[PDB]
Design a protein around this nucleic acid. Structure first.
Lengths: 386, 386
DNA sequence: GGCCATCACTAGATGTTATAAAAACTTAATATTTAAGTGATCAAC
DNA sequence: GTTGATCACTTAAATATTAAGTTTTTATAACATCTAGTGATGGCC
């Protein structure tokens, strides 16, 4: 018997009003399906949200271990298990996802075989075990029946397009999606609407189109309770405001930090961004990590020194970092800081060049603003960012 | 009976030494296969070059009519017909190609079905009836057996990559090709070596990498006597020299013009390029078309006027052209000419902008050289071409 | 006496399975055709 | 008497086709599982 059913049975023995409340949360008109859920082994709900809404409302602090145990006990032949796969992948619960894919490939149900295979392609592609042509070929081979995996196979490609910065082909795949084809599984339809909106959000930020980027980040947030999509949407909104509005930047970053509670990985994104936002706007900065070997953290300590007019100590530390292997996007920030200390145009030109080589359409604005103040042709500096 | 066999039979009745000479040209160690070719209906050669070499050596002035008739009378179920398809496509003989594909799709031979289908994908893709994901999926679906169409399906994608200026994925597909897999059909292996060398040549010219571009254009020329590959290789070498070496530019264009004799379409590429080369280097220009409505021809008459210091007549004509819908690459050249007449930096800035928007990494050098003379920071101008 | 949890029936819309029908797919085993030898046969000279 | 065009043998390697033994689609049909109603039964107040 699944931990979720044990914990619901224990709680209902105490507070006998819970079933009508669980129905409301599960979107059920009456709780007969929930009595059937607690009473009869391997009962499932038509829509996987019935179970997720409840695990979320009622046992939030144990969502992983509960949904793991429930997902890893499901009939892989069933719509529930195809939904579990989307929930697994959307939250980046790989142990669960890979396990559900394994079972669904070698299973007897044609829908669950399809979903299982297409998710394997998405997994292999995102990990870097295959390129987009291999992937797009494995899709073609699969002879996809369902509107669901027709849409999702286009989306798994949109993710690889997003990794390579490639707007034109992403939008080409996006034009071909009509989510109103998804009729069987409304959990997927809604989870895919969140994915598309997050995707559009990240490609528009990358194409340095800030107003659309927020429009789509907000649609994503309206439409979801999934931690991963909330964290990234607020990060994307936070970054959309770095140069235009310090409070909206800080506000969206802090909201995203709340939603990342107990995922140090997700929390560091916000801490590092808030570190940079505050140093950039010359504010007291509580987010610095004075203990970190990481080039990015050592840069923010240098940037604070520069803001505190400790130019000689900043230059001593920057020249120690030159002795050290840095990627191009790091050297972009290096020469920008060497620029702020020395007021040498050459440093800013290298900063612009390194950001240009790293395909960073956002950081490049930093050394370009300094070059416009030092009197370089604005019309030329604009041409560099096109 | 095929026209090629009629005309070979007629000529041999006159000069009875021809068979041993035709064998040498056909790469045959003795002419028994050629007696079998003339004597017995539907005899074919192991390698389609045996027949092409001869039609080329012996009846050059009627190569289309002869090879059409021979190709469109072949057993589509045979290696010859799969070779005819490559020869059809390589020379852009679409009437023949599409006809051979039609017959090979609905035929009973597994190899000739495969080749027939893969060429349809290449045709649909190049024409713009499908995008690269559709194509890459149709390949995946086809369950390709043969090393030949494994390599060719990668190549048909490299053509779409080339159209969209996408170096990274082109080279990714290229890394995966090993032509030493082709064991059955040495005609395809050699024809594909020419295609990939031409492909590499055009992508490197586009990435403004001129020495590699020539290296590959030259390998292509070594490896072939196909008009279309010769024409484009010499055009590519011609263009590779436009800014660096006027004589090598003019020389390679003129060689390519000889090889284009009697294809007005191919000849216009050379005439228009020689028109521009001569105007650019301020030489007497015989190639101008004073009669043409075409924006690019009217630009070269303006450019000659500018070289002859008839600036007021040049400005009158340029201002007529503004009244007129032009693509971005045309407006790039427009503002460059408006620049040369008026000495207005704004015109050169627009020229740089329009070349940048049209992804023309070669023409952009033109307005950039003017901006460097007018005193603009060369270190900044270099960053624009990164 | 009324309300409210419980929960098995129930109707009907939906989702799953299973069970032959018809296609596409290996495979291996002949069967054709190929280049290039060998050797008449007639012409030439 | 020699030569060299002609051509059908030939052999042995390579290309092709047929066949029949496996998977794989398919579809129309026959069965389970859903949600949300209905109604029972029993605490509770």
């Amino acid at each position: 018997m699944e931990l979720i059913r044990i914990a619901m049975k224990k709680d209902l023995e105490n507070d006998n009003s819970l079933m009508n409340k669980w129905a409301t949360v599960a979107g059920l008109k009456n709780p007969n399906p929930l009595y059937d859920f607690l009473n009869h082994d391997g009962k499932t709900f038509n829509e996987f949200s019935s179970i997720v809404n409840i695990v979320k409302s009622q046992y939030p602090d144990r969502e992983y271990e509960l949904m793991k145990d429930y997902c890893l006990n499901l009939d892989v032949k069933t719509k529930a298990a195809r939904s579990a796969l989307e929930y697994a992948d959307a939250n980046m619960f790989f142990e669960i996802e890979d396990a559900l894919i394994d079972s669904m490939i070698s299973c007897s149900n044609m829908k669950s075989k399809e979903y299982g295979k297409v998710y394997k392609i998405h997994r292999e592609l995102s990990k870097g075990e295959i390129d987009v042509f291999e992937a797009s070929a494995n899709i073609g081979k699969q002879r996809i029946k369902t509107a669901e995996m027709n849409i999702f196979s286009k989306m798994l490609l949109m993710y690889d397009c997003l990794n390579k910065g490639n707007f034109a082909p992403m939008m080409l795949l996006f034009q071909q999606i009509d989510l109103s084809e998804i009729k069987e599984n409304r959990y997927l339809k809604n989870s895919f609407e969140t994915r598309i909106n997050v995707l559009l959000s990240n490609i528009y930020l990358n194409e340095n189109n800030l107003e659309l980027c927020r429009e789509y980040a907000q649609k994503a947030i309206s439409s979801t309770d999934t931690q991963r999509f909330l964290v990234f949407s607020y990060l994307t909104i936070g970054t959309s405001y770095i140069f235009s509005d310090f409070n909206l930047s800080k506000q969206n970053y802090l909201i995203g930090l709340k939603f990342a509670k107990g995922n140090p990985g997700f929390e560091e994104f916000f801490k590092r961004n808030l570190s940079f936002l505050n140093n950039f706007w010359n504010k007291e900065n509580e987010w610095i990590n004075y203990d970190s070997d990481a080039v990015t953290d050592m840069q923010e300590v240098i940037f604070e020194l520069i803001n505190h007019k400790e130019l000689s100590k900043a230059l001593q530390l920057l020249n120690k970092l030159e002795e050290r292997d840095q990627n191009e996007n790091e050297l972009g920030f290096h020469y920008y800081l060497k620029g702020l200390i020395t007021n040498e145009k050459e440093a800013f030109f290298k900063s612009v060049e390194y950001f240009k080589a790293s395909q960073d359409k956002l950081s490049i604005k930093m050394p370009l603003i300094q070059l416009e103040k030092m009197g370089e042709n604005p019309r030329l500096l604009k041409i560099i960012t096109m």
